[PDB]
Structure 1
Amino acid sequence: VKYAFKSDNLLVGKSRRDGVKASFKNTYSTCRAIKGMGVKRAFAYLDNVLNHKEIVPFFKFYKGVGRHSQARGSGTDKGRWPEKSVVVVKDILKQAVSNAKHAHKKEEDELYVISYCVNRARGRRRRTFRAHGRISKYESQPCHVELIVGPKPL
C-alpha cells in the first residue's frame, strides 16, 4: 500500500525511503530529472550535480529559483543543485538497481529509471519566535521517495 507504481508483469526492481529528512520540493525535482535515464547516466548526472557541473531543472517549484546557464537545454531557464536531495536519491537508485540485478539478473546497462513518486510527509514541528511575543511554526517538509528501475520505454 506504500508503492504508487503498481507493477504490471514487467519484472522491474524497486526501492524506497519513508520520512526522508530532506526538502520535498528539492527532492521531487531531483527524481523528475533522473526519470527516463539509464541508471549509469543517472549516477553520473547526480554526481555532476554535486560537483555543480550539471543542474537539477525545477519544472514545478520554480518561484524564487534562479535562472542559470547550465539549464539552457532543460526546457526551463530556472534550475538549482540540491545536495541533500541528490545524496538521498542516489542511495535509493543504488538500492533499486541492486534489487533489480539480484531479483531478475538484469544488467545495469539495460536498466533505465522508469517511474518515481515523491509524496509529502509529516514534518518535525519546531517553533519560531516572532515580535510582540508571538510563536509561529518552523515545520519541516519531509518526503516519501519511491524510485523504480526497468527495461526502457517501449
Structure 2
Amino acid sequence: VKYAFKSDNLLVGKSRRDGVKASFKNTYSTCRAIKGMGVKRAFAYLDNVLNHKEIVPFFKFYKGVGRHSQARGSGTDKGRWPEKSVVVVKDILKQAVSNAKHAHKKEEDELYVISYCVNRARGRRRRTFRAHGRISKYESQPCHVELIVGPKPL
C-alpha cells in the first residue's frame, strides 16, 4: 500500500501504519488538526488533547459532534477529544521524526508536519440481532494512516 505523497528533491521523514483498529473519521480529524505544526508543539498539543486541555476541531464529519468552549478560535464551534486516535498518531509521528533525524542529522527544531493521508480499510464483520427474528450487521471502520515530516512550507 503505497505512499500518496510523491514530492521529489526534498528531504523528508516518512511513517505509516496500515489497517488500524481505530475510527476512520476520528483519526482523519486528528491528523488534519495537527497538519502544519512544528513537531515539538504537535507533541505538546497531542498530550494536551489526551489531558482535555485542548480539542480536535471537526471539519467534514460533524453531525452529532457537540459544540464546546475550547473551539472558540478555530473556524468552527465543534470538536472532540479522540483518545485512541491520539495514541496512534503520536506513535506514527515518533516513527517519522526518528526516521528523519537518523537519515540526516536534522533537529526537531527545523522539522514540521507537511503532509498526511488517511483512507478507509476493510472492516471486521460481526453481527447483531434485531426484533421479529431478523439479523443485521455490526461492522467497524478501520483506517490506513501515513504521515510526512520535513522543512517549512513556502
Instruction: Provide Cα deviations, 1:85-144, integer angstroms capped at 9, x if missing partner.
Output: 000000000100000100122111100000000000000011111111111111100000
Aligned-residue CA RMSD in angstroms?
Answer: 0.7
Deviation at residue 77 of structure 1 after TM alignment: 0.2
Moved over 4 A (4+): none
Instruction: Provide Cα deviations, 1:10-29, integer angstroms capped at 9, x if missing partner.
Output: 11100000000000000000
TM-score by length of 2: 0.98
1:46-57 paired onto structure 2 within 5 Å? 46-57=46-57
Q: Aligned with 1:110: secondary structure?
A: coil
Deviates more, 1:100-109 or 1:1-10: 1-10
For 1:73 and 1:60, the matched residues in 2 are separated by: 18
For 1:122 and 1:67, the matched residues in 2 are separated by: 31
Deviation at residue 67 of structure 1 after TM alignment: 0.5
Report the counterpart of residue 87 of structure 2 in structure 1.
87
For 1:17 and 1:133, the matched residues in 2 are separated by: 40
Q: Aligned with 1:108: secondary structure?
A: coil
For 2:14 and 2:40, the matched residues in 1 are separated by: 16
For 2:104 and 2:121, the matched residues in 1 are separated by: 31
Structure 1: state its 5+ residue gaps: none
Deviation at residue 146 of structure 1 after TM alignment: 0.5
Deviation at residue 58 of structure 1 after TM alignment: 0.6
Report the counterpart of residue 122 of structure 2 in structure 1.
122
Instruction: Provide Cα deviations, 1:5-49, integer angstroms capped at 9, x if missing partner.
Output: 013111110000000000000000000000000010100000000
Deviates more, 1:81-90 or 1:124-133: 124-133
Deviation at residue 74 of structure 1 after TM alignment: 1.1
**Identity among equivalent pairs (%):** 100
1:11-90 paired onto structure 2 within 5 Å? 11-90=11-90
Deviates more, 1:131-140 or 1:87-96: 131-140
For 1:136 and 1:17, the matched residues in 2 are separated by: 30
- Alignment length, in residue pairs? 154
For 1:9 and 1:17, the matched residues in 2 are separated by: 24
For 1:150 and 1:93, the matched residues in 2 are separated by: 12
TM-score by length of 1: 0.98
Deviation at residue 71 of structure 1 after TM alignment: 0.6
